[PDB]
């Protein structure tokens, strides 16, 4: 239905290619947000603060190549907002990235 | 069309590749690429170089 959660891996070292040194970490976070707005069909995604602490872990210009990300549509209950749904983009720590696909996640 | 061996890495040069180098004592060498010849011209031994053919027969890696 409308509420669902999946885990994705995001290839950051293909969306940050060729952008200048002091914009690689800020551009990464507006590539996370753009990945989620296409993947779930929602605007108003919200990045968890330990997710950008992950992408800023090696400074502004050396960003991780891949990061494992858990998306989640949620019904926007805090106000009668024009966006009925919002997306929460929590971070998944993982050692290797080999053989990881997109996986539906249970509650 | 004669297929010739790289004087540093022991690989197999095909007729469109690499460059030959005539040192002024009579000796002619063949190099596969610029990685091989810069390693050659900086005088280092291909037996201390882990990816050459001479390394892999000194250590019997086949």
């Amino acid at each position: 239905n409308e509420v669902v959660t999946r885990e994705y891996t995001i290839n950051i070292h293909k969306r940050i290619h060729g952008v200048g040194f002091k914009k690689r970490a800020p551009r990464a976070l507006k590539e996370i947000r753009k990945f989620a707005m296409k993947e779930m069909g929602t605007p108003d995604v919200r990045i968890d603060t330990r997710l950008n602490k992950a992408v800023w872990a090696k400074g502004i210009r050396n960003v991780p190549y891949r990061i494992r990300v858990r998306l989640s549509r949620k019904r926007n209950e805090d106000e009668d907002s024009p966006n009925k749904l919002y997306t929460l983009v929590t971070y998944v720590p993982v050692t290797t990235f080999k053989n990881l696909q997109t996986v539906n996640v249970d509650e | 069309m004669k297929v010739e061996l790289c004087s540093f890495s022991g690989y197999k040069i095909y007729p469109g590749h690499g460059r030959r180098y005539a040192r002024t004592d009579g000796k002619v060498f063949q190099f596969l690429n610029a990685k091989c010849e810069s390693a050659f011209l900086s005088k280092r031994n291909p037996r201390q170089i882990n990816w050459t053919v001479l390394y892999r027969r000194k250590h019997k890696k086949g």
């Binding site: - | 069309m1 690989y11 197999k12 095909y14 007729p15 469109g16 590749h17 596969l32 690429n33 086949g62």
Partner: protein
Amino acid sequence: KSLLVQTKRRALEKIDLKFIDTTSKFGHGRFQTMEEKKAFMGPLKKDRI
């Protein structure tokens, strides 16, 4: 097809190919085929799993 009448000796040369290179153009390729590269390099680590 050309608009001219080809009368030069270079234009009327019968050719006969002898070798066609098939090394990888995505870098400095060394190996003409796949079966050559495997027969030279030997069994790697990721094969013997």
